[PDB]
Short mmCIF file of all heavy atoms in Angstrom, two decimals:
data_model
loop_
_atom_site.label_atom_id
_atom_site.label_comp_id
_atom_site.label_asym_id
_atom_site.label_seq_id
_atom_site.Cartn_x
_atom_site.Cartn_y
_atom_site.Cartn_z
N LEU A 1 230.56 1.67 136.96
CA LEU A 1 229.91 2.68 137.84
C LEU A 1 230.72 2.96 139.10
O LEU A 1 231.01 4.12 139.37
CB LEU A 1 228.48 2.23 138.19
CG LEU A 1 227.62 3.24 138.96
CD1 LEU A 1 227.50 4.56 138.25
CD2 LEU A 1 226.28 2.64 139.27
N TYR A 2 231.03 1.93 139.84
CA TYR A 2 231.60 2.04 141.20
C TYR A 2 232.97 2.74 141.22
O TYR A 2 233.40 3.24 142.23
CB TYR A 2 231.73 0.66 141.87
CG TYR A 2 230.40 0.05 142.32
CD1 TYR A 2 229.18 0.47 141.77
CD2 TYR A 2 230.38 -0.96 143.29
CE1 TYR A 2 227.97 -0.11 142.19
CE2 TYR A 2 229.17 -1.52 143.71
CZ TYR A 2 227.97 -1.09 143.15
OH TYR A 2 226.77 -1.62 143.54
N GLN A 3 233.64 2.79 140.04
CA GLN A 3 234.91 3.50 139.93
C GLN A 3 234.73 5.01 139.83
O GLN A 3 235.68 5.78 140.13
CB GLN A 3 235.69 3.00 138.71
CG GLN A 3 236.09 1.55 138.72
CD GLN A 3 236.56 1.05 137.38
OE1 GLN A 3 237.05 1.84 136.56
NE2 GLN A 3 236.38 -0.25 137.12
N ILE A 4 233.55 5.48 139.47
CA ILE A 4 233.32 6.91 139.23
C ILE A 4 232.31 7.55 140.18
O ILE A 4 231.92 8.69 140.00
CB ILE A 4 232.84 7.18 137.77
CG1 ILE A 4 231.44 6.62 137.55
CG2 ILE A 4 233.84 6.54 136.78
CD1 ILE A 4 230.64 7.39 136.52
N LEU A 5 231.91 6.81 141.24
CA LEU A 5 230.95 7.37 142.20
C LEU A 5 231.65 8.37 143.12
O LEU A 5 232.79 8.18 143.55
CB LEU A 5 230.34 6.23 143.07
CG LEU A 5 229.37 5.29 142.39
CD1 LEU A 5 228.97 4.20 143.35
CD2 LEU A 5 228.18 6.04 141.86
N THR A 6 230.97 9.46 143.40
CA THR A 6 231.44 10.45 144.38
C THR A 6 230.96 10.01 145.75
O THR A 6 230.19 9.08 145.89
CB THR A 6 230.85 11.85 144.13
OG1 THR A 6 229.43 11.81 144.29
CG2 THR A 6 231.20 12.35 142.71
N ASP A 7 231.50 10.71 146.78
CA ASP A 7 231.07 10.44 148.18
C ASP A 7 229.55 10.59 148.30
O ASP A 7 228.88 9.71 148.84
CB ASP A 7 231.79 11.41 149.12
CG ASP A 7 231.26 11.33 150.55
OD1 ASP A 7 230.88 10.23 151.00
OD2 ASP A 7 231.28 12.35 151.25
N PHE A 8 229.03 11.66 147.76
CA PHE A 8 227.54 11.89 147.77
C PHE A 8 226.81 10.79 147.01
O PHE A 8 225.73 10.34 147.50
CB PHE A 8 227.17 13.25 147.20
CG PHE A 8 225.69 13.56 147.38
CD1 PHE A 8 225.22 14.14 148.54
CD2 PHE A 8 224.78 13.20 146.37
CE1 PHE A 8 223.87 14.38 148.70
CE2 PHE A 8 223.43 13.47 146.54
CZ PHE A 8 222.96 14.06 147.71
N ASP A 9 227.33 10.35 145.87
CA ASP A 9 226.65 9.29 145.09
C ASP A 9 226.47 7.99 145.93
O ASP A 9 225.41 7.38 145.93
CB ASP A 9 227.46 8.92 143.82
CG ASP A 9 227.36 10.00 142.74
OD1 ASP A 9 226.39 10.80 142.72
OD2 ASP A 9 228.25 10.02 141.86
N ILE A 10 227.55 7.61 146.60
CA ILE A 10 227.52 6.43 147.46
C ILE A 10 226.46 6.60 148.55
O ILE A 10 225.61 5.72 148.71
CB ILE A 10 228.90 6.13 148.09
CG1 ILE A 10 229.97 5.90 147.01
CG2 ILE A 10 228.84 4.94 149.04
CD1 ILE A 10 231.40 5.88 147.53
N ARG A 11 226.46 7.72 149.21
CA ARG A 11 225.44 7.99 150.25
C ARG A 11 224.08 7.91 149.65
O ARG A 11 223.17 7.29 150.24
CB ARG A 11 225.65 9.37 150.88
CG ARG A 11 226.93 9.55 151.69
CD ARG A 11 227.13 10.96 152.11
NE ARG A 11 228.49 11.23 152.54
CZ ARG A 11 228.86 11.61 153.76
NH1 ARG A 11 227.98 11.71 154.76
NH2 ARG A 11 230.15 11.84 154.00
N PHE A 12 223.91 8.54 148.49
CA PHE A 12 222.58 8.63 147.86
C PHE A 12 222.03 7.26 147.45
O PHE A 12 220.89 6.96 147.73
CB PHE A 12 222.63 9.58 146.64
CG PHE A 12 221.34 9.63 145.87
CD1 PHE A 12 220.34 10.52 146.24
CD2 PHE A 12 221.14 8.83 144.78
CE1 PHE A 12 219.16 10.60 145.55
CE2 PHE A 12 219.95 8.89 144.07
CZ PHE A 12 218.95 9.77 144.45
N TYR A 13 222.88 6.42 146.84
CA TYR A 13 222.43 5.12 146.37
C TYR A 13 222.29 4.11 147.49
O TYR A 13 221.40 3.23 147.45
CB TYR A 13 223.36 4.54 145.27
CG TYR A 13 223.30 5.27 143.96
CD1 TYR A 13 224.45 5.77 143.33
CD2 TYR A 13 222.07 5.48 143.32
CE1 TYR A 13 224.38 6.48 142.13
CE2 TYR A 13 221.99 6.15 142.11
CZ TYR A 13 223.15 6.63 141.51
OH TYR A 13 223.06 7.31 140.32
N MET A 14 223.15 4.20 148.52
CA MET A 14 222.99 3.35 149.69
C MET A 14 221.67 3.64 150.40
O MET A 14 221.00 2.76 150.88
CB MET A 14 224.18 3.51 150.65
CG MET A 14 225.45 2.75 150.24
SD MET A 14 225.29 0.95 150.23
CE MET A 14 224.86 0.62 148.54
N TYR A 15 221.28 4.94 150.42
CA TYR A 15 220.00 5.33 151.04
C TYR A 15 218.83 4.75 150.27
O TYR A 15 217.91 4.21 150.87
CB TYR A 15 219.92 6.87 151.08
CG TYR A 15 218.90 7.44 152.05
CD1 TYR A 15 219.06 7.32 153.43
CD2 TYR A 15 217.78 8.11 151.58
CE1 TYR A 15 218.13 7.84 154.30
CE2 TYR A 15 216.82 8.66 152.48
CZ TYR A 15 217.04 8.49 153.85
OH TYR A 15 216.13 9.01 154.73
N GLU A 16 218.88 4.87 148.95
CA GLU A 16 217.82 4.31 148.08
C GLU A 16 217.69 2.79 148.25
O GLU A 16 216.58 2.27 148.31
CB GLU A 16 218.09 4.65 146.61
CG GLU A 16 218.00 6.16 146.28
CD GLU A 16 216.60 6.70 146.45
OE1 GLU A 16 215.71 6.28 145.69
OE2 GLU A 16 216.42 7.57 147.33
N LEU A 17 218.80 2.12 148.32
CA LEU A 17 218.84 0.67 148.55
C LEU A 17 218.26 0.30 149.90
O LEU A 17 217.48 -0.62 150.00
CB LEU A 17 220.26 0.11 148.38
CG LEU A 17 220.45 -1.39 148.55
CD1 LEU A 17 219.47 -2.15 147.71
CD2 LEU A 17 221.89 -1.79 148.25
N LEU A 18 218.64 1.06 150.95
CA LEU A 18 218.07 0.90 152.27
C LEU A 18 216.56 1.10 152.31
O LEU A 18 215.90 0.38 153.05
CB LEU A 18 218.77 1.81 153.27
CG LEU A 18 220.17 1.43 153.70
CD1 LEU A 18 220.91 2.57 154.42
CD2 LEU A 18 220.13 0.18 154.63
N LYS A 19 216.04 2.03 151.54
CA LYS A 19 214.57 2.21 151.42
C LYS A 19 213.91 0.89 150.93
O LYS A 19 212.86 0.53 151.46
CB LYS A 19 214.20 3.31 150.45
CG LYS A 19 214.47 4.70 150.94
CD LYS A 19 214.24 5.72 149.81
CE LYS A 19 214.50 7.14 150.22
NZ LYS A 19 214.42 8.09 149.07
N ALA A 20 214.54 0.23 149.98
CA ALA A 20 213.99 -1.02 149.43
C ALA A 20 214.01 -2.12 150.49
O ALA A 20 213.10 -2.90 150.66
CB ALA A 20 214.70 -1.43 148.19
N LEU A 21 215.15 -2.24 151.21
CA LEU A 21 215.32 -3.26 152.21
C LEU A 21 214.41 -3.05 153.42
O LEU A 21 213.81 -3.99 153.91
CB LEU A 21 216.77 -3.37 152.65
CG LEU A 21 217.77 -3.88 151.57
CD1 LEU A 21 219.16 -3.92 152.15
CD2 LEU A 21 217.31 -5.22 151.01
N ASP A 22 214.29 -1.79 153.91
CA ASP A 22 213.37 -1.52 154.99
C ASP A 22 211.95 -1.88 154.52
O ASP A 22 211.19 -2.45 155.26
CB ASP A 22 213.38 -0.04 155.43
CG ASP A 22 212.37 0.26 156.50
OD1 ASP A 22 212.44 -0.36 157.58
OD2 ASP A 22 211.52 1.14 156.28
N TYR A 23 211.62 -1.54 153.27
CA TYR A 23 210.27 -1.86 152.77
C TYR A 23 210.02 -3.34 152.73
O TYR A 23 208.97 -3.79 153.27
CB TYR A 23 210.02 -1.24 151.38
CG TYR A 23 208.58 -1.35 151.04
CD1 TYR A 23 207.63 -0.48 151.56
CD2 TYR A 23 208.10 -2.37 150.18
CE1 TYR A 23 206.28 -0.57 151.25
CE2 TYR A 23 206.75 -2.45 149.86
CZ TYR A 23 205.85 -1.58 150.40
OH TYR A 23 204.51 -1.63 150.09
N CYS A 24 210.89 -4.11 152.10
CA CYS A 24 210.61 -5.55 152.01
C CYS A 24 210.65 -6.23 153.38
O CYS A 24 209.81 -7.07 153.69
CB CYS A 24 211.53 -6.24 150.99
SG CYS A 24 213.25 -6.52 151.46
N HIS A 25 211.61 -5.82 154.26
CA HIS A 25 211.62 -6.36 155.62
C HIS A 25 210.32 -6.01 156.34
O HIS A 25 209.82 -6.84 157.13
CB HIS A 25 212.80 -5.85 156.42
CG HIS A 25 214.14 -6.22 155.87
ND1 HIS A 25 215.34 -5.65 156.26
CD2 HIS A 25 214.50 -7.12 154.93
CE1 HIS A 25 216.35 -6.19 155.61
NE2 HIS A 25 215.85 -7.09 154.77
N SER A 26 209.75 -4.82 156.12
CA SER A 26 208.53 -4.41 156.78
C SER A 26 207.32 -5.20 156.25
O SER A 26 206.33 -5.32 156.94
CB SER A 26 208.24 -2.91 156.58
OG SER A 26 207.63 -2.62 155.31
N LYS A 27 207.46 -5.75 155.05
CA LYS A 27 206.47 -6.64 154.48
C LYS A 27 206.76 -8.13 154.78
O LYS A 27 206.17 -9.03 154.17
CB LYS A 27 206.41 -6.42 152.95
CG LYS A 27 206.04 -4.98 152.53
CD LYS A 27 204.73 -4.46 153.09
CE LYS A 27 203.51 -4.90 152.31
NZ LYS A 27 202.26 -4.19 152.78
N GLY A 28 207.63 -8.38 155.76
CA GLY A 28 207.89 -9.75 156.21
C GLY A 28 208.71 -10.56 155.30
O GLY A 28 208.67 -11.76 155.33
N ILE A 29 209.55 -9.93 154.47
CA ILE A 29 210.28 -10.59 153.41
C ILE A 29 211.79 -10.33 153.49
O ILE A 29 212.22 -9.17 153.64
CB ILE A 29 209.70 -10.21 152.03
CG1 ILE A 29 208.35 -10.84 151.83
CG2 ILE A 29 210.71 -10.64 150.92
CD1 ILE A 29 207.41 -10.03 150.93
N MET A 30 212.57 -11.41 153.40
CA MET A 30 214.02 -11.34 153.26
C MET A 30 214.35 -11.51 151.76
O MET A 30 213.82 -12.40 151.13
CB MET A 30 214.67 -12.54 153.99
CG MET A 30 214.37 -12.64 155.45
SD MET A 30 215.15 -14.14 156.13
CE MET A 30 213.89 -15.37 155.79
N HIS A 31 215.27 -10.71 151.26
CA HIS A 31 215.68 -10.81 149.84
C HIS A 31 216.61 -11.98 149.62
O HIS A 31 216.45 -12.78 148.68
CB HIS A 31 216.31 -9.50 149.37
CG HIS A 31 216.63 -9.47 147.90
ND1 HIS A 31 217.79 -10.01 147.38
CD2 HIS A 31 215.95 -8.95 146.86
CE1 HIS A 31 217.80 -9.86 146.07
NE2 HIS A 31 216.72 -9.23 145.73
N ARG A 32 217.63 -12.05 150.47
CA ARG A 32 218.61 -13.15 150.57
C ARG A 32 219.60 -13.25 149.38
O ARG A 32 220.38 -14.21 149.32
CB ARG A 32 217.93 -14.51 150.77
CG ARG A 32 216.92 -14.51 151.90
CD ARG A 32 216.61 -15.94 152.34
NE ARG A 32 216.05 -16.74 151.27
CZ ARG A 32 215.72 -18.01 151.37
NH1 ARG A 32 215.85 -18.68 152.53
NH2 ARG A 32 215.18 -18.64 150.34
N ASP A 33 219.62 -12.27 148.47
CA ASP A 33 220.61 -12.25 147.39
C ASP A 33 220.98 -10.80 147.02
O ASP A 33 221.01 -10.44 145.84
CB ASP A 33 220.06 -13.02 146.14
CG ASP A 33 221.18 -13.43 145.17
OD1 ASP A 33 222.35 -13.42 145.56
OD2 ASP A 33 220.86 -13.73 144.00
N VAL A 34 221.25 -10.01 148.06
CA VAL A 34 221.64 -8.62 147.87
C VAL A 34 223.08 -8.60 147.43
O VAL A 34 223.97 -9.15 148.09
CB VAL A 34 221.39 -7.80 149.13
CG1 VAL A 34 222.01 -6.36 148.96
CG2 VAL A 34 219.88 -7.70 149.44
N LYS A 35 223.32 -8.02 146.23
CA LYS A 35 224.65 -7.90 145.65
C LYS A 35 224.55 -6.88 144.50
O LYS A 35 223.43 -6.56 144.06
CB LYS A 35 225.12 -9.24 145.11
CG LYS A 35 224.18 -9.91 144.14
CD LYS A 35 224.84 -11.14 143.50
CE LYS A 35 223.82 -11.88 142.62
NZ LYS A 35 224.44 -12.99 141.87
N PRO A 36 225.70 -6.34 144.02
CA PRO A 36 225.66 -5.37 142.95
C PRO A 36 224.87 -5.80 141.70
O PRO A 36 224.14 -5.00 141.15
CB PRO A 36 227.13 -5.17 142.63
CG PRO A 36 227.81 -5.38 143.93
CD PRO A 36 227.02 -6.44 144.66
N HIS A 37 225.05 -7.04 141.26
CA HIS A 37 224.32 -7.59 140.13
C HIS A 37 222.79 -7.52 140.29
O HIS A 37 222.06 -7.51 139.30
CB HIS A 37 224.74 -9.04 139.82
CG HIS A 37 225.97 -9.15 138.98
ND1 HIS A 37 227.12 -9.73 139.45
CD2 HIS A 37 226.20 -8.76 137.72
CE1 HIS A 37 228.03 -9.69 138.51
NE2 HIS A 37 227.50 -9.10 137.42
N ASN A 38 222.28 -7.53 141.50
CA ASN A 38 220.88 -7.42 141.81
C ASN A 38 220.38 -6.00 142.18
O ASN A 38 219.23 -5.84 142.66
CB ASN A 38 220.48 -8.45 142.89
CG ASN A 38 220.46 -9.84 142.38
OD1 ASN A 38 220.37 -10.08 141.16
ND2 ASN A 38 220.52 -10.81 143.28
N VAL A 39 221.20 -5.03 141.96
CA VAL A 39 220.85 -3.63 142.17
C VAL A 39 221.03 -2.85 140.88
O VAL A 39 222.19 -2.54 140.49
CB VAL A 39 221.65 -3.00 143.30
CG1 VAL A 39 221.26 -1.53 143.51
CG2 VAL A 39 221.48 -3.78 144.58
N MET A 40 219.95 -2.56 140.18
CA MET A 40 220.00 -1.84 138.93
C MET A 40 220.05 -0.34 139.23
O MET A 40 219.21 0.15 139.96
CB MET A 40 218.76 -2.15 138.06
CG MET A 40 218.60 -3.62 137.68
SD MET A 40 219.84 -4.22 136.52
CE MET A 40 221.19 -4.67 137.63
N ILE A 41 221.05 0.32 138.66
CA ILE A 41 221.22 1.74 138.85
C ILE A 41 221.26 2.51 137.53
O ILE A 41 222.20 2.31 136.72
CB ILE A 41 222.49 2.04 139.65
CG1 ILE A 41 222.37 1.49 141.04
CG2 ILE A 41 222.74 3.58 139.70
CD1 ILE A 41 223.53 1.89 142.00
#
């Protein structure tokens, strides 16, 4: 995937991932294993 992402794709998926992190942090939770293998796209 990462070899074929456009500039917009990167922005778009980083935004979606940030939504998840803001959400879990707002619920008092740290994920502690953020990595590509743990982000299903």
Side-chain angles (χ1 to χ4, degrees):
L1 184 57
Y2 287 20
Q3 298 167 27
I4 70 148
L5 289 176
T6 65
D7 173 33
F8 187 86
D9 287 337
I10 298 168
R11 294 172 196 245
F12 176 87
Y13 290 127
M14 281 294 94
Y15 197 69
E16 294 294 295
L17 180 52
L18 285 165
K19 289 173 181 173
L21 293 181
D22 179 58
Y23 191 78
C24 75
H25 298 166
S26 81
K27 301 304 275 188
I29 288 150
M30 302 177 275
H31 185 277
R32 310 198 300 179
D33 198 17
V34 172
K35 56 171 174 174
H37 276 116
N38 286 340
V39 180
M40 299 291 85
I41 296 186

